[PDB]
């Protein structure tokens, strides 16, 4: 428990809470007056409470790191347990893991048993191979088999390393061990019995979310007065001091917002409070943001909670249903519950769409419970206006259009800026909010059946009747979007567990070869030629700048003096791998290192050499380039448009574009494929500027999808839905 | 006057006046209540009057026009929604009447569009353009409603529009009118908003109104955001107009304290006004939470009213229900902070990232009076998009919506001017070309001009434009330009580009209230606007007054003013006092053309405090609630170098003029220098003037076309220096050296009164001085090898006679007053120092480097121009400067050191100690305490003032302000103080040394820089052999060991300097002062023994 401060940097662990674990377990845990059964109960509940006390104050992605360690503590298997923590038509990357696993005596069967089975290909391509795993290795215990197939599934499909971990814990500590995380936070009970006075209630907030409203809701719930003062002003500091003194004297509730901004007074508060004996049921709440600024001593003292978008579609509906009170959702008419369920479902869809970014939503817009609260207020107002004095309303008389417009424009669409995201929000709101939603066989996704109730009670059990086997197909996004994140979590398991268990010489070798890879570039009113000459000019100038800088680095590293200012900075950014600002003159993705920069630059310089050869030879029309390898692809598009306009003596406005599969190469299409101009759910693109059931797909330079440059009109196959192509996220990519 | 700044935007108070001129009158023979009742009864009459012909199938022009002229601008437009909404409500309640209403709107639009084609007064024309804007909104909304079939008013498509309900039976005349919306139900404020300027109601702007209408129906605020220049503040103003309450616009900077916004909210609540706060991206992170507290506390009382008092600065004060807060961010830009997450919970956010440029380009162009505005807008908007996408990535371009609005208003002005010059047809496609040439063409670099004109030829085929000429102003520039010895051109001569840029600047000034300059240092910005102001003052007869403020050197508290926190007291800054004196009109400043110029570099912390004066309704805000309405006749200018650290929130507001380095060529500098030399005497026809004119006649062949100086200068940019070479410094140093040549000829004539100088010897002196001065001005700040290479090139270019030494570079010669070369070895005799001065402070062993540098420093300090000495540590800058000073019994020195956290206050304290103040009729002059005796400020470390975030030191800017204008601003009385007898000499190590930054070019232009290197084995051996011979006289028997000892230490210091340097430790500095400590130690050890 204590050694997690070297991983999280957010949770700080003290002995007082670990003894509070005994104070609760050994005195308040329900049960029998038999020593052996009592010992069994205490031992079984110790792990449960150890996870429950801790996991409410740390991020969800680490909930599997701690619990699996608690599977080790309760756990002969240690000989083979280190293999998956220090070990690092089958493909090469899977073959490496296979051969590395084959070294163990226990997995000697991997040499020949992998090819004998003809069902292995189906298992590898399975949607969920965690449920059933072929055994390749004295009958073993369930825990031993779980460990063996854990090593095997990492050796075969590391993308499903995380999910197996979740079941492995259930093999040791119980199926319902992690189930209490996927539930609303019981704030009232915890402040009732688990939080003492002289112990601040720390509430961490991931960016894009907060917990200020929770404490106000609690204060209104218990019918108690509370004093709330933020942090950042001297007058506020003095009022907060008066408030904390009065609350200590009288037992009152005190509330401080954004204490991370003033670490001085915050550090003072810890020593003010620990040496004080206050009135009973006196509670101070501090809200903060996760950063390495807050005093560590205050984190050792208080009760830490982490607030964030909860994982999974299931948990979000429970959180929403807990947030709305019981009385409001059950008010007449009975279709109010239906619209509330639809709103909650739509909110869950969008918020989980944010997590699988940028493939679902390119820009990570912030969406919180303020938006849901305003939407619920709007729904209540509309139903009050429409259904005044009546108990039952038809689906057709519901103002579907007004609700759709207001959710699409003001409440949720205001934070939407890109046109494509706005039209996707329109697609959601039109697909879900309609009179078809009240049919018995309506489908929320394509399958899932909507419940056919009228009150709030019957909807509740269906939410947790949803299977835990969740895939992104619930959202509409392709399932392969998991493979980017799940693997990113898998390597997050092995690394975070491992912690739990000269420069000139480098640079000289680093820039001996890089000049060898790079090359040299050789330099009237034609619209294509002017922009091409400008491109070659910029390329030659920046290439010469880079070559001179690398030559200076080589000379200073070899020892030929040149020990100057602004070259040691280049040494620093070259050793660290951060791309220096001296070379970032065009758009590249963030975090893109120097070796990738050189790999891209070599191909760019080769392309510009070919451009120079073509221009020198006009033939500039029949030359093929790849967008993204041009510093300003917008300039190339405009030059093509103006060349067509001048060739045919047309106005520059009256010239639109058609696309067929001017030659443009090097493009890629993600999410679909096309053969005969119909998109089925791009070796060479032909562009024809023509005068004057298709889909408008964007084009982005980088996979981050920051800024758009170009749109393409594509036909669709007859067997596919035009609306679903917005949801799935098919896009044109230049890299 | 005071009503202009607090109470709405009216001018002064029988009735209420306005800036544009329209005046209301009281109905009934308490400022707020009376004027609202008067407005309500006016609207009550207006609705009944306009409902008579509401079914406008056929409209009588006379009655319609006199109804426009009878009533006010805000009432006519408002009564044009009231009648519309009632008519459409009646029609949709009962689609024939809907089509009839569409036809009525079309007929009304046609009759009003026929009026603009005829000449109209501006007073009626503004209202009529606003009515065209409204009625285009009406026709587009009505055709949208008919396009998608509707059945009743309960459908959202009708429900989500600005429908206006009028109740004739309402007793409360203030509650007589209401406006509706999606869930909203408001009452119109009936404040005398006035005319102002009605926006274009685009669909994005429609979403913008709708979201904040929903927010204000509930108790929340409105938070437009997105890239700058898309219509956030103007959208909030549009809500204020459409809902009838004037919105106070406040620009926010770090100067706010919590008490300031405390009284802002108290003032808003006590009267019931609206607030629009422009910035929450620079108001400090902790302070954002500190004010989130207050803005959350007010909303609770607001909701309690919804179901009265609230706490504001620990005071229970009443809150009127008619209150609203809107904010604005400019997110995503570099020079800004983040927001706390709790604040966003209180506020609805809508993004302005793509305003509808087509319909805004259409409707107002059509309202101005363009017959074919549809095609013109359809051609100009994609032209803007093409210009944005294809032009090169320059940080100073600005093609947002503000640029389009400026271009089209310029087109309207051009149309009016052409109508006055000449009716139905005047080529309208050429008007847009002329407007683009007036506004957009000047700000492009020379590379992109062909691209822009190719676009103009393509998207606007034909109608090729011919550039006009303002011959009166051009002849005025002929008459004023030559007075100050400046060259003129015809637009095709050698000096035509510069005067064309001045004319372009005049054009931008006429239309853009905010003006700005961008270009490399020394391209003629200051001279350009100075000659323009002088010509304008001589032509129109209106006195031209210029104020200059350097904001970077001055602290922000001193610049803009600062509130005293102990007791709220408003101490004004520079700009605040300037505006106060212009507004108060103590001397008559309102009748004079007055410009305010901001030189220095840009930085976001001060430029964006002016974002509230460069918009519509130009007005400055201060934390104390004091507001300053900007004068009409003034212009705020910037004179900056580049915008590598500026954001588009202020780069788009101000019209731009760009100077390339080729605008000001070398020949014009030569002509200016020679004209100044011929006309103005150096000492202040006199003998000095005769010598000057003779020298100018001698040297004129060398100062034109290629000649010699230009060939040398373009050959010199291929040779590296300490730092980046600039042309104009390199020529100013030469000019000063030539002035010293004239003074030296005067000295020679003073030596022999009976034998005046002869021309045949004068040439032999002056060509030799020319080549010597070219050498030391072009290779002063460089290594000796660079000096040798440049010597060789200068030898090849010109026929000036040269030494015949086979292997002596020409830099190592002196030009004698006799008019011939002399080696420098004649002035460095081998001298023996005294026994007690073997090693002492302020002792100089003469060597050719030392004497050469002494001569050069003498030449630059003789003219009393600033100077900089920079080279590696130990070179001898301090002692060489002091040696040069010791030969001059008319100047003393003040040593001064700059720390890395230094301030201008250090120099101010030094001046307060060593100098004094006196009030003269000419103003305030800072005088040295010794009369007639020069006072030098030696700065031992010039390149380490405090380094700001955005690449500009403060003290360097202060010394720049000292040098260029000969003074500064004394902040105790914020007044102009000018120097009398102070020159600035400084020194540094090279900027390539590790902790030292490079020096700004705009200050490097003024000061010449000389490179002083450590002597090395050539001269150190001589120097310390002299010291060893002088030191081994204490022991007569050891005098034979002076030579082999010097060769030893000098070898070891050569052996140790190459090994240990800054690459291993920060303070591994090797200098000849180590040899000074050497000889001091050996001398103080051998002094008293007397036998070793
Ligand atoms: N058109 C011109 N012809 C000749 N000399 C000129 C011209 N314009 C300016 N100069 C001279 O150039 C020098 C500097 O000019 P000016 O002060 O106008 O430059 P600037 O662009 O304002 O400078 P900086 O940007 O470096 O502060 C002065 O000697 C001025 O006389
Ligand atoms: N709908 C509109 N009608 C008329 N002018 C507009 C409209 N939208 C924007 N503008 C013009 O664009 C500019 C936008 O300024 P502003 O909204 O203050 O930018 P910022 O919010 O970045 O300060 C204004 O000068 C305004 O005249
Ligand atoms: N050319 C020279 N002739 C004689 N002494 C010299 C010469 N150059 C340097 N020295 C001696 O060595 C010292 C070098 O240190 P100096 O450059 O003066 O200090 P700083 O780093 O402040 O410029 C001089 O002060 C002087 O005493």
| Cα–Cα dist B199/B217, whole Å | 23
Q: Which of residues 196-225 of B touch A (CB under 8 A)?
A: 207, 210-211, 214, 218, 220
Q: Which residue has the tokens 């001064």?
A: B896
Which residue's alpha carbon is at the smallest distance from atom 5 of ligand 1? B669
Phi-psi region of B149 (alpha: psi -120 to 50; beta: other; left: phi over 0): beta
Max Cα–Cα distance, chain A, nearest Å: 101
B480 class by beta-carbon count within 10 Å (0-12 exposed, 13-18 middle, 19+ buried): buried
Do B184 and A343 meet the contact criterion of CB atoms below 8 Å apart? no
Do B833 and B843 meet the contact criterion of CB atoms below 8 Å apart? yes
| Cα–Cα dist A204/A57, whole Å | 8
Do A4 and A66 meet the contact criterion of CB atoms below 8 Å apart? yes
Cβ within 8 Å of residue B161, ≥6 positions away: B141
Cβ within 8 Å of residue B250, ≥6 positions away: B264, B275, B276, B277, B278, B612, B621
Do A201 and A305 meet the contact criterion of CB atoms below 8 Å apart? yes
| Cα–Cα dist B226/B400, whole Å | 13
Q: Return the HEC string of B967-1026.
A: EEEECCCCEEEEECCEEEEEEECCCCCCCCCCCCHHHHCCCCEECCCCCCHHHHHHHHHH
Closest Cα to residue B1002, out of B671, B787, B728, B696?
B728
Q: Which of residues 127-146 of A touch B (CB under 8 A)?
A: none
Bridge partners of A285, per DSSP, are A201, A255
Taken as a whole, chain A contains a residue count of: 735
The partner residue sitting opposite B350, judged by closest CB among A414, A419, A534, is: A414
Bridge partners of B597, per DSSP, are B548, B637
| Cα–Cα dist A156/A117, whole Å | 14
Closest Cα to residue B535, out of B468, B479, B482, B595?
B479
Ligand 3 contact, B845 CB (< 6 A) = yes
Q: What's the CA dihedral at B861, B863, B869, B875 to 10 degrees?
A: -40
Distance from the Cα of B185 to chain A's closest Cα (Å) equals 13
| Cα–Cα dist A349/A711, whole Å | 27
| Cα–Cα dist A49/A72, whole Å | 16
Q: Which two tokens stand for residue A646?
A: 């001048």
- Looking from the CA of A577 toward its CB, the CA atoms found within 13 Å total 6
Inter-chain touch B353–A417, beta carbons under 8 Å: yes
Q: If DSSP codes are grouped into helix, strand and coil, which group holds residue A687?
A: strand
Q: Which of residues 718-757 of B touch A (CB under 8 A)?
A: none
| Cα–Cα dist B728/B1005, whole Å | 6
Q: If DSSP codes are grouped into helix, strand and coil, which group holds residue B249?
A: strand
Q: Which two tokens stand for residue B824?
A: 């420098």
Q: Which two tokens stand for residue A466?
A: 């949803």
B824-829 contact pairs (CB < 8 A, 24+) = B824/B848, B824/B851, B824/B852, B827/B851
Do A677 and A658 meet the contact criterion of CB atoms below 8 Å apart? no
| Cα–Cα dist A671/A480, whole Å | 10
Buried b (16+ CB within 10 A) or exposed e, B357-367: bebbbbbbbbb
| Cα–Cα dist A56/A63, whole Å | 9
Q: What's the CA dihedral at A284, A289, A291, A295 to 10 degrees?
A: -10
Cβ within 8 Å of residue A142, ≥6 positions away: A171
- Looking from the CA of A336 toward its CB, the CA atoms found within 13 Å total 27
| Cα–Cα dist A114/B518, whole Å | 71
| Cα–Cα dist B854/B871, whole Å | 16
Q: Which two tokens stand for residue B413?
A: 């002005």
Q: If DSSP codes are grouped into helix, strand and coil, which group holds residue B883?
A: helix
Inter-chain touch A642–B349, beta carbons under 8 Å: no
Q: How far is CA A296 from CA A259, A286, A499, in A?
A: 13, 14, 20
B569-578 contact pairs (CB < 8 A, 24+) = B570/B622, B570/B623, B570/B624, B570/B626, B572/B974, B573/B974, B574/B549, B574/B969, B574/B974, B575/B549, B576/B622, B576/B628, B577/B974, B578/B547, B578/B549
| Cα–Cα dist B899/A207, whole Å | 41
| Cα–Cα dist B163/B277, whole Å | 28
Do A205 and B341 meet the contact criterion of CB atoms below 8 Å apart? yes
Inter-chain touch B182–A645, beta carbons under 8 Å: no
Distance, CA of A406 to chain centre: 27
Closest Cα to residue B1075, out of B1037, B1032, B1021, B1030?
B1021
Cβ within 8 Å of residue B1014, ≥6 positions away: B871, B872, B874, B875, B876, B1020, B1071, B1072
Do A575 and A506 meet the contact criterion of CB atoms below 8 Å apart? yes
Q: If DSSP codes are grouped into helix, strand and coil, which group holds residue A672?
A: coil
| Cα–Cα dist A481/B910, whole Å | 68
Count contacts between A and B (CB, < 8 Å): 146
Phi-psi region of B522 (alpha: psi -120 to 50; beta: other; left: phi over 0): left
Taken as a whole, chain B contains a residue count of: 1092
Q: Which two tokens stand for residue B433?
A: 């070309």
Q: Which residue has the tokens 């490079």?
A: B998
Can you list the alpha helix ranges (DSSP code H) found in B448-495?
449-459, 471-481
Closest Cα to residue A84, out of A70, A73, A68?
A68
Distance from the Cα of A87 to chain B's closest Cα (Å) equals 41
Cβ within 8 Å of residue A242, ≥6 positions away: none
| Cα–Cα dist B869/B1008, whole Å | 9
B458: chain A residues, CB-CB within 8 Å: 642, 645-646, 651-652
The ligand with the least distance to the CA atom of B940 is: 3
Do A362 and A418 meet the contact criterion of CB atoms below 8 Å apart? yes
Q: If DSSP codes are grouped into helix, strand and coil, which group holds residue A535?
A: helix
| Cα–Cα dist B439/B870, whole Å | 45
Q: Which two tokens stand for residue A629?
A: 């390898």
| Cα–Cα dist A53/A180, whole Å | 11
B341, B346, B394, B1062: best to mutate for the A interface, most A CBs within 10 A: B341
Which residue's alpha carbon is at the smallest distance from atom 21 of ligand 2? B232
Q: What's the CA dihedral at A635, A639, A645, A649 to 10 degrees?
A: 130
Helix, strand, coil content of chain B in percent (nearest 5): 50, 10, 40
| Cα–Cα dist B135/B107, whole Å | 10
Inter-chain touch A635–B226, beta carbons under 8 Å: no
Q: Which two tokens stand for residue A385?
A: 């206006």
The helix or strand, by DSSP H or E, that contains position A356, with its residue range, turns out to be: none
| Cα–Cα dist A92/A444, whole Å | 40
The partner residue sitting opposite A652, judged by closest CB among B182, B207, B459, is: B459
| Cα–Cα dist B577/B598, whole Å | 15
| Other C-beta atoms lying within 10 Å of the C-beta of residue A356 | 18
Buried b (16+ CB within 10 A) or exposed e, B915-936: beeeeeeeeebbbbeeeeebbb
Cβ within 8 Å of residue B996, ≥6 positions away: A565, B943, B944, B988, B989, B990
Inter-chain touch A530–B450, beta carbons under 8 Å: yes
Q: If DSSP codes are grouped into helix, strand and coil, which group holds residue B379?
A: helix
Start-to-end Cα distance in chain B: 93
| Cα–Cα dist B1028/B1040, whole Å | 10
B392 touching A (Cβ < 8 Å): yes
The ligand with the least distance to the CA atom of B616 is: 2
DSSP string spanning B172-217? SGGGSEEEE-SS-EE--------S-------HHHHHHHHHHHHHHH
Do A318 and A288 meet the contact criterion of CB atoms below 8 Å apart? no
Cβ within 8 Å of residue B734, ≥6 positions away: B709, B773, B774, B777
The helix or strand, by DSSP H or E, that contains position A512, with its residue range, turns out to be: helix A503-517
Task: Give B364 Cα–ligand 2 centroid separation in angstroms.
Answer: 14
Q: Which of residues 604-663 of A touch B (CB under 8 A)?
A: 632, 634-635, 637-639, 642, 645-646, 651-653
Q: How many helices (H) and strands (E) are present in chain B, helices listed first?
A: 37, 30
| Cα–Cα dist B777/B985, whole Å | 17
The helix or strand, by DSSP H or E, that contains position A312, with its residue range, turns out to be: none
Task: Give B550 Cα–ligand 1 centroid separation in angstroms.
Answer: 18
Q: How far is CA B284 from CA A237, B253, B255, B279, in A?
A: 17, 9, 10, 11
Q: CA nearest A409 in B: which residue?
A: B207
Do B929 and B975 meet the contact criterion of CB atoms below 8 Å apart? no
Q: How far is CA B603 from CA B329, B517, B965, in A?
A: 18, 15, 22
| Cα–Cα dist A702/A676, whole Å | 26
Do A706 and A679 meet the contact criterion of CB atoms below 8 Å apart? no
A204, A229, A529, A565: best to mutate for the B interface, most B CBs within 10 A: A565
The partner residue sitting opposite B289, judged by closest CB among A258, A414, A525, is: A258
Q: Which residue has the tokens 């890109």?
A: A418
């Amino acid at each position: 428990m204590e050694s997690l401060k070297q991983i999280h940097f957010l949770y700080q662990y003290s002995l007082q809470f670990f003894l509070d674990i005994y104070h609760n377990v050994l005195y308040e845990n329900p049960n029998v007056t038999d020593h052996t059964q009592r010992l069994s109960i205490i031992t079984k509940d110790l792990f449960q409470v150890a996870f429950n006390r801790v996991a409410r104050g740390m991020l969800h992605q680490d909930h599997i790191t701690f619990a699996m360690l608690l599977a080790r503590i309760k756990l002969t298997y240690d000989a083979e347990f280190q293999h998956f923590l220090r070990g690092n038509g089958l493909t090469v990357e899977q073959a490496e893991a296979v051969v590395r696993l084959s070294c163990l005596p226990a997995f000697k069967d991997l040499i020949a048993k992998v090819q004998a089975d003809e069902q292995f290909g189906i298992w590898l391509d399975s949607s969920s191979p965690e449920q059933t795993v072929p055994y390749l290795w004295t009958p073993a215990t369930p825990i031993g088999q779980a460990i063996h197939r854990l090593l095997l599934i990492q050796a075969f499909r590391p993308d499903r390393l995380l999910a197996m971990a979740h079941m492995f814990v259930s093999t040791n500590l119980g199926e319902s061990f992690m189930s209490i995380m996927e539930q609303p936070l019981d704030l009232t009970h915890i402040v009732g019995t688990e939080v003492k006075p002289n112990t601040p209630v720390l509430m961490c907030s991931v960016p894009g979310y907060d917990a200020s409203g929770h404490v106000e809701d609690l204060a209104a719930e218990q019918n108690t007065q509370i004093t709330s003062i933020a942090i950042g002003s001297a007058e506020g500091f003095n009022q907060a001091d008066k408030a904390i003194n009065t609350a200590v004297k009288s037992g009152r509730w005190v509330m401080l917002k954004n204490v991370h901004l003033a670490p001085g007074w915050l550090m003072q508060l810890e020593k003010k409070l620990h040496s004080l004996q206050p009135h009973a049921c006196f509670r101070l709440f501090l809200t903060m943001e996760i950063n390495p600024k807050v005093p560590v001593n205050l984190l050792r003292a208080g009760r830490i909670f982490v607030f964030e978008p909860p994982p999974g579609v299931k948990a979000n509906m429970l959180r929403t249903f807990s947030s709305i009170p019981v009385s409001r959702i059950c008010k007449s008419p009975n279709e109010r519950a239906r619209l509330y369920f639809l709103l909650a479902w739509f909110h869950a869809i969008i918020q989980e769409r944010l997590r699988y970014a940028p493939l679902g939503w390119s820009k990570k817009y912030e969406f919180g419970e303020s938006d849901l609260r305003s939407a619920c207020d709007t729904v209540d107002t509309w139903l009050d206006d429409t259904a005044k004095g009546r108990q039952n309303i038809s689906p057709d008389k519901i103002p579907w259009s007004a609700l759709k417009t207001l959710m699409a424009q003001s409440i949720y669409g205001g934070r939407v800026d890109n046109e494509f995201d706005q039209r996707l929000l329109n697609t959601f709101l039109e697909r879900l909010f309609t009179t078809r939603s009240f049919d018995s066989e309506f489908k929320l996704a394509c399958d899932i059946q909507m419940p056919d109730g009228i009150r709030r009670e019957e909807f509740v059990q269906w939410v947790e009747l949803l299977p835990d086997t969740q895939t992104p197909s619930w959202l509409g996004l392709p399932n392969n979007a998991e493979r980017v994140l799940l693997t990113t979590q898998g390597v997050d398991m092995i690394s975070k567990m491992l912690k739990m268990q000269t420069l000139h010489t480098t640079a000289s070798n680093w820039l001996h070869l890089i000049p060898q890879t790079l090359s040299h570039l050789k330099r009237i009113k034609d619209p294509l030629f002017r922009f091409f000459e400008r491109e070659v000019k910029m390329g030659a100038k920046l290439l010469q700048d880079v070559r001179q800088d690398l030559a200076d680095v080589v000379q200073v590293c070899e020892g030929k003096k040149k020990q100057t200012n602004y070259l040691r900075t280049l040494i620093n950014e070259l050793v660290k791998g951060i791309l220096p600002r001296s070379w970032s003159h065009y758009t590249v993705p963030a975090g893109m290192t120097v070796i990738q920069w050189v790999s891209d630059f070599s191909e760019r310089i080769k392309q510009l050499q070919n451009i120079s050869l073509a221009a020198a030879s006009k033939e500039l029309k029949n030359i093929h380039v790849c967008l993204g390898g041009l510093f300003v692809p917008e300039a190339y598009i405009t030059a093509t448009r103006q060349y067509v306009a001048q060739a045919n003596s047309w106005s520059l406005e009256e010239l639109c574009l058609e696309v067929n599969v001017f030659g443009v190469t090097g493009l890629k299409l993600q999410g679909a494929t096309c053969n005969n101009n119909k998109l089925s759910l791009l070796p060479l693109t032909q562009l024809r500027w023509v005068k004057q059931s298709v889909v408008t797909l964007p084009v982005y330079l980088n996979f981050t999808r920051a800024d758009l440059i170009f749109t393409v009109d594509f036909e669709i196959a007859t067997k596919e839905d035009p609306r679903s192509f917005y949801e799935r996220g098919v896009a044109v990519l230049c890299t | 006057k005071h009503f202009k700044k607090m109470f709405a935007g009216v001018s002064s108070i029988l009735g209420i006046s306005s800036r544009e001129g329209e005046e209301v009158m009281f109905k009934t023979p308490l400022v707020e209540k009376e004027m609202r009742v008067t407005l309500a009864k006016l609207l009550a009459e207006s609705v009944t009057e306009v409902e008579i012909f509401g079914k406008a199938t056929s409209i009588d022009p006379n009655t319609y026009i006199t109804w426009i002229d009878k009533y006010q601008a805000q009432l006519v437009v408002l009564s044009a929604q009231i009648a519309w909404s009632e008519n459409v409500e009646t029609a949709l309640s009962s689609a024939a009447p809907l089509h009839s209403v569409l036809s009525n709107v079309e007929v009304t639009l046609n009759v009003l569009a026929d009026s603009v084609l005829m000449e109209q007064p501006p007073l009626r024309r503004r209202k009529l353009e606003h009515l065209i804007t409204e009625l285009v909104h009406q026709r587009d909304v009505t055709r949208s409603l008919i396009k998608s079939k509707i059945d009743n008013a309960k459908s959202f498509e009708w429900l989500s529009q600005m429908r206006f309900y009028f109740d004739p039976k309402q007793t409360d005349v203030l509650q007589q009118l209401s406006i509706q919306m999606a869930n909203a139900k408001f009452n119109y404020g009936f404040e005398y908003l006035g005319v102002q300027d009605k926006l274009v109601q685009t669909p994005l702007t429609d979403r913008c109104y709708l979201t904040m209408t929903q927010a204000l129906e509930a108790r929340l605020g409105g938070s437009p955001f997105g890239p700058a220049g898309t219509g956030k503040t103007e959208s909030v103003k549009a809500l204020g107009h459409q809902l009838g309450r004037f919105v106070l616009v406040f620009n926010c900077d770090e100067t706010f304290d919590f008490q300031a916004m405390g009284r802002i909210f108290v003032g808003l609540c006590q009267v019931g006004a609206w607030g629009c706060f422009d910035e929450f991206n620079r108001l400090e992170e902790r302070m954002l939470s500190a004010v989130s507290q207050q803005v959350q506390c007010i909303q609770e009382a607001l909701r309690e009213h919804s179901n009265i008092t609230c706490e504001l600065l620990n005071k229970q004060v009443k809150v009127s229900p008619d209150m609203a807060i809107f904010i604005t961010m400019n997110p995503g830009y570099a020079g800004r902070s983040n927001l706390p997450d709790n604040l966003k919970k209180l506020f609805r956010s809508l993004a302005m990232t793509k305003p509808d440029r087509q319909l805004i380009a259409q409707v107002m162009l059509y309202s101005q009076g363009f017959r074919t505005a549809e095609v013109l807008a359809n051609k100009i908007v994609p032209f803007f998009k093409l210009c944005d996408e294809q032009l090169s990535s320059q940080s100073h371009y600005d093609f947002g919506l503000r640029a389009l609005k400026s271009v089209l208003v310029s087109a309207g002005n051009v149309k009016r001017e052409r109508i006055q010059k000449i009716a139905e047809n005047l080529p309208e496609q050429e008007i847009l070309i002329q407007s683009v040439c007036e506004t957009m063409v000047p700000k492009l670099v020379a590379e992109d001009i062909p691209l822009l004109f190719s676009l103009l030829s393509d998207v606007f085929p034909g109608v090729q434009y011919h550039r006009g000429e303002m011959t009166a102003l051009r002849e005025e520039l002929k008459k004023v330009c030559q007075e100050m010895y400046l060259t003129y051109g015809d637009g095709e001569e050698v000096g035509g580009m510069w005067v064309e840029k001045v004319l372009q600047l005049y054009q931008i000034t006429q239309i853009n209230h905010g003006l700005m300059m961008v270009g490399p240092s020394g391209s003629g910005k200051s001279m350009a606007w100075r000659v323009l102001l002088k010509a304008l003052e001589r032509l129109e007869g209106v006195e031209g007054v210029a104020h200059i403020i350097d904001p970077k050197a001055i602290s922000k508290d001193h610049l803009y003013g600062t509130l005293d926190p102990n007791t709220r007291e408003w101490t004004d800054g520079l700009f605040t006092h300037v505006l106060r004196k212009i507004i108060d009109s103590v001397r008559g400043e309102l009748q004079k053309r007055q410009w305010i110029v901001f030189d220095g570099d840009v930085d976001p912390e001060w430029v964006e405090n002016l974002n509230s004066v460069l918009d519509d309704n130009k007005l400055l805000t201060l934390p104390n609630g004091e507001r300053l309405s900007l004068p009409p006749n003034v212009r705020i200018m910037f004179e900056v170098q580049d915008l590598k650290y500026a954001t588009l929130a202020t780069v788009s507001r101000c019209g731009m003029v760009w100077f390339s380095e080729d605008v000001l060529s070398t020949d014009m500098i030569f002509n200016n220098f020679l004209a100044r030399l011929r006309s103005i005497p150096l000492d202040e026809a006199s003998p000095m003037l005769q010598i000057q004119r003779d020298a100018a006649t001698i040297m004129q062949p060398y100062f034109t076309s290629n000649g010699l100086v230009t060939k040398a200068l373009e050959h010199a940019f291929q040779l590296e220096h300490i730092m980046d070479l600039t042309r104009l410094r390199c020529l100013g140093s030469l000019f000063s050296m030539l002035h010293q040549a004239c003074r030296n000829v005067a000295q020679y004539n003073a030596n022999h009164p009976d034998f005046p100088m002869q021309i045949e010897q004068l040439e032999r002196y002056i060509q030799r001085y020319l080549v010597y001065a070219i050498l030391w001005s072009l290779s002063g700040d460089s290594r000796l090898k660079m000096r040798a290479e440049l010597g060789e090139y200068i030898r090849r270019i010109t026929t000036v006679p040269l030494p015949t030494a086979p292997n002596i570079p020409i830099i190592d010669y002196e030009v004698s007053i006799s008019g011939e070369w002399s080696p420098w070895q004649a002035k460095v005799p081998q001298i023996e120092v005294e026994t007690h001065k073997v090693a002492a402070p302020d002792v100089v062993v003469p060597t050719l480097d030392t004497v050469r540098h002494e001569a050069l420093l003498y030449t630059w300090l003789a003219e009393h121009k600033p100077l900089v000495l920079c080279g590696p540590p130990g070179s001898g800058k301090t002692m060489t400067l002091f040696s040069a000073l010791r030969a001059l019994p008319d100047m003393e020195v003040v040593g001064l050191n700059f720390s890395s956290a230094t301030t201008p206050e250090l120099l101010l304290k030094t001046f307060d100690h060593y100098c004094e103040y006196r009030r003269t009729p000419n103003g305030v002059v800072l005088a040295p305490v010794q009369l007639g005796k020069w006072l030098v400020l030696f700065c031992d470390e010039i390149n380490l003032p405090d380094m700001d975030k955005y690449g500009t030191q403060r003290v360097i800017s202060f010394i720049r302000q000292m040098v260029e204008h000969g003074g500064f601003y004394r902040t105790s009385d914020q007044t102009w103080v000018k120097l009398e007898r102070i020159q600035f000499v400084g020194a540094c190590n090279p900027p390539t040394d590790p902790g030292r930054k490079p020096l700004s070019h705009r200050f490097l232009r003024h000061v010449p820089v000389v490179y002083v290197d450590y002597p090395g084995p050539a001269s150190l051996t001589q120097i310390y052999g002299t010291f060893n011979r002088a030191m081994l006289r204490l022991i007569p028997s050891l005098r034979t060991y002076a030579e082999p000892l010097t060769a030893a230490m000098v070898e070891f210091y050569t052996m140790s300097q190459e090994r240990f340097t800054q690459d291993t430790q920060p303070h591994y500095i090797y200098s000849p002062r180590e040899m000074t400590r050497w000889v001091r130690g050996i001398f103080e050890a051998l002094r008293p023994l007397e036998t070793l």
